RNA sequence: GGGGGCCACUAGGGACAGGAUGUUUUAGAGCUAGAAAUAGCAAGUUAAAAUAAGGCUAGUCCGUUAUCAACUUGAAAAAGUG
DNA sequence: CAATACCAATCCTGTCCCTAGTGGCCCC
DNA sequence: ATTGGTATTG
């Protein structure tokens, strides 16, 4: 009895089919067990298990992390507390117990009501005095007063609980006078040194403009409106953009060939200014300087708008601006409405419901919607133009806690608390004791490379401490270890050597490391000159004179540099060819040059002796990102540099890893030669072997060195081993369900194994804001005003040609002309590479034409001439990111000659070879469990083939064949997938044992592109329908002459197999998990649905969570009490057990049922109802638990193949193609039977009302499809397709008839599955427990 | 076919440290005329505290991923059953 | 019981590791 | 986008 399984590997589902030696599937009985009439049942051998995705763990790790950041700032105030605990107890024993309890209800308060003073008169004074914190906050830093110590303390907290961003580095103390004297000092150093060219500054209120209230470009353009000439942009035009925004490249004015932008924040600014100037000149820097003098003082422009002469409060006072100007502003708003439009006032001031004032301080109207809402009304009255001018701004009636906060460093709070501390001191010594500890409180961060602060029970913790003490924000520099902790952060994440386990890898811009890979690629150079009779490769004199000459004093070394500057300068040649290495070479000592241009001394570089400093250096700044820790590590070679070039040193710092360790490439040594891998490649004989070479030659050490060196270890699970694996953890579930599903089969099959098993696996399938990302970023970097023309939302940008359209900056990417978007209609979306060799449907192959026509020749590549003209435009594109390299390349493919006749041949190999890298994991595991066997030379023995396919081969033979997939029919097509994978490739394999190599797991460009593009061939009676040709009816293999396909009987045996009804579809049942509920914090309400937030917080009086979720039902067999009586009552129902509940039931069942009210529960008979828990009531009418009181649809609509596929005809289901007269023939076979429609309505009746049971709704479907008879036939079919969301399988769902919308009917009660048949189902359903529930009662 | 190093991109996976909102209850004395219902007017921008219930191992830690038909012997982890 | 209508926390900064898809140089 | 929870209406 020999077999085949076909499986179909998928991101739901895993459809899998057994199939014989004739390509039929069969069926057996599968004794049944549980409780009914039913021994026994027949099941097809063919199916598909269904499960919802697999999830990231992304969501839990923002979880995660938020709730480590709400317990340490609780921690941060209560360190604050403890600080001001024992005077505070003196002032008022019980503020803080008041400011604890403030949540709750006075019922339940145990102190007074009022929680700073603890009385009325005192309270309502406070706000009176201080109606905003930021009041408070402005006071306290700008009095000199003794304040009461309760106010200090809010203004402490206050700074210390929103305490801002730390994205700047170092100190912050802002001043934002002498910004016009600043800007006339810019201009005059710009006059000073173009003294021939000056600008006249005078009369330009440089503050208001560049301190404005709009962006960083608005006001670049306002101020060079006030410069007559100085177009923005010119020199001094950039100059200004360099405060406001990324400086676009100065190239354009000092006649570079290079990009010369500059970025204040970046820490490359500090190399590129020098980069720059080395270019331009010294003379130029003061400029620059001055330009950076400017920027400090207008740095914050946007964050405090208000001058810093008045107070140290800055902030605080920018907070009482919009405070002062929110009521002002209201006043006049109210008088206004009052005066002209007394109608509305209530809806605007008082209706909370409405997007007005009242909703925007009560309702749930943000910012953005209330300015919409008042907008019009504004513009419909007299005297609103200033609140409309304040609108478009963004600064009407602006609250102070806002969404756009985010920018205030913590360099600002800090100032402000100091400020308080500094006032306040002076009255409280114990403030003056602590104003470092609180001030630490604020600053502190634990640094990322730390991590977690466990003791020994976080799996996700690496730190190390110094001593054994708890971790507080001033003892964190003695108790943790930060060297440690900070070497660990990378260490557990870094790949070991592959060649040598134990061995870690070099930094990947270690100096060895780069003459590692230099030397590689030089070693496989060879050249030719005339009078050699063949090419010969560099010595190792040659190859050390090229790396000093050349690799030593450029960073990139072109192969015209190799060809001029040394075999010309040298070696006397005026010709030369050169071959191993193509325009550039691809290593370089990138790292050389840094430390060349840090520390000035070619001679310390070039001594070998240095060569372990120089590595550990580089260690240093790959391993820390701290320069406080990179500076202690550097301090023991403080010696050996100037002061000034170790603090060049210093902010010298590299990411990034390599893959080969340092005793690899220059530490073992070959037993006989002494040498080491470094020293082979750097002479090597006339041999010059390579790294590869080296390792793999038998004649040296290094070989069996590497063999010793290697280690297995202990090895994974099944599970660990799938988990471990690069890819989706959608789709990992999918592998271990299909290994889980093969286990199965093979003992379904009397534990006999297959002959084959063929695989194939699915293809790759929020996302507008990266739409949205990549246009603003491209579009800016291109200088283009489009987005200022035509502005765009996110959604719209999922329209592939509005997207395509904003991608080549609203142009046609053939012809040097523009596109219209009211147009988008009549243009055309091309292939750059055609779609009929590669099949991608990606943007990097798509491009927005107005007619393809223009691409040129449809067979090929863009045609020369396009890319001649528009190659710039193309380069343009790419660099502002707008196309990818691969895009461009493809795109200029035809300057390189075009596609070749073996890139087609490759293009057709790769539509049929699977080599994707995850299909291959799958096959390995498959592989390895099936073939565990050594032969007499102890070489595996593969008793199973595993043999994997692409999707294409499948489609392509249902379209050729008519066995037509409708995948909204039901879920069968998963199964059917499977079937006709089996057959196909067993099939393919049978015909042709040579493809074995392809498509097999294990270890003339025209012919292989006639060969693959035929492969196929063997199936059809009649090929290319070039010229005809015609194959025999029964096909065998060649050399053994074994039948293979009979296309007699064979193809009638897969209609047989696509036209059983009985399918075994198994949903998988799983336990949910997660979050508990809902997590929307609701008001309080009379209802037992709403949880409490905390074990004391009364829903009723506090409000809380609803809705949680099921993480499993239960069956409970019990009594209840009943009436006042309290009389027992025997019950039988579903108890959902929520995820929050799960733990305590499941610690002890009985107890946890007797507080929900159960008694006398039958412990026995408590059965656990995940999810999808599979009942059978009447007539076959099955249902699966939605929860504990919601079902879902059960049973699945087999429809006969015929309807099938009159459907898949009918409705154009993608496309016809064909011959004319096979077009055709199939239009006058769908015209032929259009009774066929009536026919499938009735189906799909009898089906609903037998086991769908929604009256209203199939009635409301038989009237829409009456309605619409006179339709096309396409239409009307297309509609019957969207009909099957009435009977498919799983939740219902609503859907459209034509223009009709059907609503989903639910099913709200689980009362009926209470005595109905449980089924419980093995993975492949071919295995049940049936269970009578009408046996189960009291 | 499979595999390795390097260059140029691109797509995804994982961990850590942080920021701004949002929500919820309470505090921010509503007034006047009416018995009241209600009407007219005034006011509004802020704060505290929680932010999965909670847990024990008590850490400035952990709490939403992965994995799960039934039955059996099993504390479990297992293995087995048609 | 129904049928049905509404609802669902959001956005952002930085450090770092890893695999794998496309094209290319050289190899086992 | 789904789809299971919830109140509302009847
Ligand atoms: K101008
Ligand atoms: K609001
Ligand atoms: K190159
Ligand atoms: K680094
Ligand atoms: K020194
Ligand atoms: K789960
Ligand atoms: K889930
Ligand atoms: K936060
Ligand atoms: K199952
Ligand atoms: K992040
Ligand atoms: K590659
Ligand atoms: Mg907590
Ligand atoms: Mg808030």
Redesign the pocket.
């Known amino acids: 009895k020999k077999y085949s399984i076909g499986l179909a590997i998928g991101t739901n589902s895993v459809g899998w089919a057994v199939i014989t030696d004739e390509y039929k599937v069969p069926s057996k009985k ?4 549980g409780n009914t009439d039913r021994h026994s049942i027949k099941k097809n051998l063919i199916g598909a298990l269904l499960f919802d995705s ?8 923002l ?10 700032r ?2 941060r ?1 209560c360190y604050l507390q403890e600080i001001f605990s024992n005077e505070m107890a003196k002032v008022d024993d019980s503020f803080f117990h008041r ?2 309890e ?5 019922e339940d308060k145990k102190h007074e ?3 700073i003073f603890g009385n ?2 005192d ?2 004074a406070y ?1 009176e005095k201080y ?3 930021y009041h408070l906050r402005k006071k306290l830093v700008d009095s000199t007063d003794k304040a009461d110590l309760r106010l200090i303390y ?1 203004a402490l ?2 700074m210390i ?7 700047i580095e170092g100190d912050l103390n802002p001043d934002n006078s002498d910004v016009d004297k600043l800007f006339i000092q810019l201009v005059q150093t710009y006059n000073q040194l173009f003294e021939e060219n000056p600008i006249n500054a005078s009369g330009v209120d440089a503050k208001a403009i560049l301190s404005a209230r709009l962006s960083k470009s608005r006001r670049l353009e306002n101020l060079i409106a006030q410069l007559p000439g100085e177009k923005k942009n010119g020199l001094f035009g950039n100059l200004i953009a360099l405060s406001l925004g990324l400086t676009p490249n100065f190239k354009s004015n000092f006649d570079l060939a290079e990009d010369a932008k500059l970025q204040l924040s970046k820490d490359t600014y500090d190399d590129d200014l020098d980069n720059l100037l080395a270019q331009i000149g010294d003379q130029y820097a003061d400029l620059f300087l001055a330009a950076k003098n400017l920027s400090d003082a207008i740095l914050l422009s946007d964050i405090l708008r208000v001058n810093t002469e008045i107070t140290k409060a800055p902030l605080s006072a920018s907070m009482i601006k ?2 002062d100007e ?2 002002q502003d ?1 006043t006049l708003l ?1 008088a206004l409405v009052r005066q002209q439009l007394p109608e509305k006032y209530k809806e605007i ?2 209706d909370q419901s409405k997007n007005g ?2 909703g925007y ?2 309702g ?1 109207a943000s910012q953005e919607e209330f300015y919409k809402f008042i907008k019009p009304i504004l513009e419909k009255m007299d005297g609103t133009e200033e609140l409309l001018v304040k609108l478009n701004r963004e600064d009407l009636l602006r ?8 920018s ?1 460093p913590h360099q600002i709070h800090l100032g402000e608390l100091h400020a308080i501390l500094r006032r306040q001191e002076d009255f409280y010594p114990f403030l003056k004791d602590n104003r470092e500890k609180i001030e630490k409180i604020l600053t ?5 490379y ?6 020994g ?2 799996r ?2 690496w730190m190390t401490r110094k001593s054994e003490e ?4 001033w003892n964190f520099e003695e108790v943790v270890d930060k060297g440690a902790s900070a070497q660990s952060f ?1 260490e557990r ?3 070991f050597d592959k060649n040598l386990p134990n061995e870690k ?1 070099l930094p990947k811009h270690s100096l060895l490391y780069e003459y590692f ?1 230099v030397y ?2 030089l070693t ?1 150079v060879k050249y030719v000159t005339e009078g050699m009779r063949k090419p010969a490769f560099l010595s190792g004199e040659q190859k050390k004179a090229i790396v000093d000459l050349l690799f030593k004093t450029n960073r990139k070394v072109t192969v015209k540099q190799l060809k001029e500057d040394y075999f010309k300068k040298i070696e006397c040649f005026d010709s030369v060819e050169i ?4 325009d550039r070479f ?2 370089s000592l990138g790292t050389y040059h840094d430390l060349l241009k840090i520390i000035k001394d070619k001679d310390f570089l070039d001594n070998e002796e240095n060569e372990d400093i120089l590595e550990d250096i580089v260690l240093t700044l790959t391993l820390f ?1 701290d320069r406080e820790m990179i500076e202690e590590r550097l301090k023991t070679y403080a010696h050996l540099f100037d002061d000034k070039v170790m603090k060049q040193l210093k902010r010298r ?1 590299y ?6 360790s340092r005793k690899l490439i220059n530490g073992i040594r070959d037993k006989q030669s002494g040498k080491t891998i470094l020293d082979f490649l750097k002479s090597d004989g006339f041999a010059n072997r ?4 080296l390792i ?1 030659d038998d004649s040296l050490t290094f070989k069996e060195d590497i063999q010793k060196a290697q280690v297995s270890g202990q090895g994974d699970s099944l ?1 660990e081993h799938i ?1 471990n694996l ?1 890819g ?2 959608a789709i ?2 999918g592998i ?2 299909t290994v ?1 599903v093969v286990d199965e089969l093979v003992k379904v099959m009397g534990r006999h194994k297959p002959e084959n098993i063929v695989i194939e696996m699915a293809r790759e399938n929020k996302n507008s ?1 990266e739409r949205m990302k990549r246009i603003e970023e491209g579009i800016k970097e291109l200088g283009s005003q489009i987005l200022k023309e035509h502005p765009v939302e996110n959604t719209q940008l999922q329209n592939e040609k509005l997207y395509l359209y904003y991608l080549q900056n609203g142009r046609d990417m053939y012809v040097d002309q523009e596109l219209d978007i009211n147009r988008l209609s009549d243009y055309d979306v091309d292939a750059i590479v055609p779609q009929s060799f590669l099949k991608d449907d990606s943007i990097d192959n798509k491009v927005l034409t107005r007619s393809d026509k223009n691409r040129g020749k449809s067979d090929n590549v863009p045609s020369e001439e396009v890319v001649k003209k528009m190659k710039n435009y193309w380069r343009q594109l790419l660099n502002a ?1 707008l196309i ?3 895009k461009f ?1 493809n795109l200029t493919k035809a300057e390189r000659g075009g596609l070749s006749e073996l890139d087609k041949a490759g293009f057709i190999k ?1 539509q049929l070879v699977e ?4 299909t ?1 994991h799958v096959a390995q595991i498959l592989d390895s469990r099936m073939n565990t066997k050594y032969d007499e030379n102890d070489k595996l023995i593969r008793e199973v083939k595993v043999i994997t396919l692409k999707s294409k081969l499948v489609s392509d033979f249902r379209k050729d064949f008519q066995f037509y997939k409708v995948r909204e029919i039901n879920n069968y097509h998963h199964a059917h997938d499977a079937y006709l994978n089996a057959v196909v490739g067993t099939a393919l394999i049978k015909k042709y044992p040579k493809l074995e ?2 498509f097999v797991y294990g ?1 003339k460009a025209t012919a292989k592109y006639f060969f693959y593009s035929n492969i196929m061939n063997f199936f059809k009676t009649e090929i290319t329908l070039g010229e005809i040709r015609k194959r025999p009816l029964i096909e065998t293999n060649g050399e053994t002459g074994e039948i293979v396909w009979d296309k007699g009987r064979d193809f009638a045996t897969v209609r047989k197999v696509l036209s059983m009804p009985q399918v075994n579809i198994v949903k ?4 949910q ?4 509920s ?8 009379n ?1 037992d ?1 709403l949880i ?4 004391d917080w009364d829903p009723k ?3 809380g969570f ?3 979720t ?1 993480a499993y039902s239960v069956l409970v067999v019990a009594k209840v009490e009943k009436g006042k009586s309290k009389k027992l009552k025997s019950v039988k129902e579903l108890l ?1 057990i929520t ?2 509940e799960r ?2 039931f499941e610690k002890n069942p009985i107890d946890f049922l007797e507080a929900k009210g159960y008694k006398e529960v039958k412990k026995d008979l408590i059965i ?1 109802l ?1 999810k999808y828990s599979l009942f059978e009531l009447e007539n076959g009418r099955k249902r699966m638990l ?5 079902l ?1 649809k059960g049973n699945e609509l087999a429809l006969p193949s015929k309807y099938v596929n009159f459907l898949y005809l009918a409705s154009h289901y993608e496309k016809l193609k064909g011959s004319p007269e096979d077009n055709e023939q199939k239009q006058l076979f769908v015209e032929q039977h259009k009774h066929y429609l009536d026919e499938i309505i009735e189906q799909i009746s009898e089906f609903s009302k037998r086991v769908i049971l929604a009256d ?1 709704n199939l009635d409301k479907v038989l009237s829409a499809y009456n309605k619409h008879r006179d339709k096309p036939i396409r239409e009307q079919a297309e509609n019957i397709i969207h009909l099957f969301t009435l009977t498919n399988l ?2 219902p ?1 609503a859907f459209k008839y034509f223009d009709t919308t059907i ?1 989903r009917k ?1 099913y ?2 689980t ?1 009926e599955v209470l005595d109905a048949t449980l089924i ?4 492949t359903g071919l ?3 049936r269970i009578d529930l009408s046996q189960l009662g009291g």
């Open positions: 599968f004794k049944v067990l697999g999830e990231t763990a992304e969501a839990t790790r979880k995660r992390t938020a709730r480590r950041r709400y317990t340490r609780k921690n105030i400011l604890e403030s949540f709750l209800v006075e009501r009022h929680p009325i008169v309270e309502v706000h109606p905003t914190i809010l907290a206050h609980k929103f305490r801002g961003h730390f994205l919009r405070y929110h009521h209201l109210k001031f008082f004032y009242a301080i009560d749930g609250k102070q806690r806002t969404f756009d906060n985010g205030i502190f961060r634990i640094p990322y730390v991590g977690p602060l466990a003791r029970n976080s996700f913790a708890t971790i507080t924000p990378i994440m870094t790949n890898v890979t590689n690629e496989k071959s191993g290495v193509e691809n290593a990102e710092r990411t990034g890893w390599g893959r080969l390579n790294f590869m070479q793999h599970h988990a690069a989706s953890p990992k579930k271990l369900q889980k804001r990111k990818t390299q691969r390349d790769r080599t994707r890298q995850i291959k190599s392809e270890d998988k049942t799983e336990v998990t997660g979050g508990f809902k997590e929307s914090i609701l008001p309080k309400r209802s649905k409490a937030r905390k074990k009086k506090y409000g609803d809705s949680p099921v959902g995820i929050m733990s305590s656990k995940p939605a929860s504990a009181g919601e879902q209203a799983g939740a769902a609503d639910r709200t009660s009362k419980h189902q093995s993975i295995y049940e427990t």
